[PDB]
Amino acid sequence: FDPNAWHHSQMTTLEAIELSRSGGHPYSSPNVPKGFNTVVGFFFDTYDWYPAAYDDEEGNAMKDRELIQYEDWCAKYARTLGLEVKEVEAPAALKVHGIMALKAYPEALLEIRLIEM
Amino acid sequence: FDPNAWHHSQMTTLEAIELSRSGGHPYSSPNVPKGFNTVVGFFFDTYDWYPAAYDDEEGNAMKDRELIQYEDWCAKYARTLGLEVKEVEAPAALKVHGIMALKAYPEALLEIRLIEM
């Protein structure tokens, strides 16, 4: 374990630790229109991120079987319900895995899937 | 057994039995636009109705605690999501309790609450 190593969250290990202790996370997208969020963003806005969360995935949250399911569900119901879906820039921690952009869904839809079910 | 005694579903006892045996129910509304349905309509379109279902309520399905919850849920999320909500004529089995109209929600919204949850 090295303190100075670059963490897969695209910051120093120390910075990752400070970020997690402050209740933050690295997976928020920039310039997300108000009332929208990405699945991964809303998930860690709700639940706690800890630096070792995606060690096995080398930081690629979008390999999480849990988050993939949520993403598939949100895509499905936003379409059948005629909801607006926005495209937003991926966070650096996902840009480094080849994900350039993410779908952002209405927060009410995320609330149903991520909190109620 | 009186086959011609009036059932609270607003048909003869015999008629209610025959309707139940054919997989029908008395709680559908007339002239519901395609892709919409009421809570009570969708519920019994999904699950089996039997004549004695609402003996205790003298046929007022909208006194069912479950169905009240589903209705409250759909009104809440239809509003927050900005979904279209239509007003439709109540079926006779509810007009007899003073309910003149029911709210009709998008079928996708009903699928979530009544089947997935």
Author numbering:
A (entry chain H), B (entry chain A): 17 to 133
Q: Can you list sentences taken from the study reporting this PDB entry?
A:
Here we identify two Brucella abortus effectors, NyxA and NyxB, that interfere with host protease SENP3, and this facilitates intracellular replication of the pathogen.
To gain further insight into the function of NyxA and NyxB and their interaction with SENP3, we solved the crystal structure of NyxB at 2.5 Å. The asymmetric unit of the crystal contains 12 monomers of NyxB, but no significant differences were found between them and thus, only the structure of subunit A is described hereafter. The NyxB model encompasses residues 17–134, suggesting that residues 1–16 are flexible. Search for structural homologues (DALI server and EMBL fold) did not reveal any significant homology and thus makes of NyxB structure a prototype for this protein family. The association of dimer 1 (chains A and H) buries a total of 530 Å2, while dimer 2 (chains A and J) relies on fewer interactions burying a total of 400 Å2.
